[PDB]
Amino acid sequence: ALFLTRNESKPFYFIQKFNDFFDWSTSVFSSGVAYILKRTIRFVLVFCIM
């Protein structure tokens, strides 16, 4: 609350590339989560095999 600006400005160009990389990473993560939740039984068996 002391020093943290509400609006963060001037992001680094590599960080901005990192931000898009992390964004598509979380998109693929959400897709994988949806695929796993679609078929529970196989991943339960995967956990047992693990």
For the chain, helix (H) and strand (E) counts, in that order, are 2, 0
CB burial string 30-49: b at 16+ within 10 A, e below: eeeeeeeeeeeeeeeeeeee
Q: Which of 27, 28, 35 is nearest to 43 (CA)?
A: 35
Determination approach: cryo-EM
Return the SS3 of 2: coil
- Lookup: tokens for 44: 């339960």
CA gap 18, 12 in Å, rounded: 9
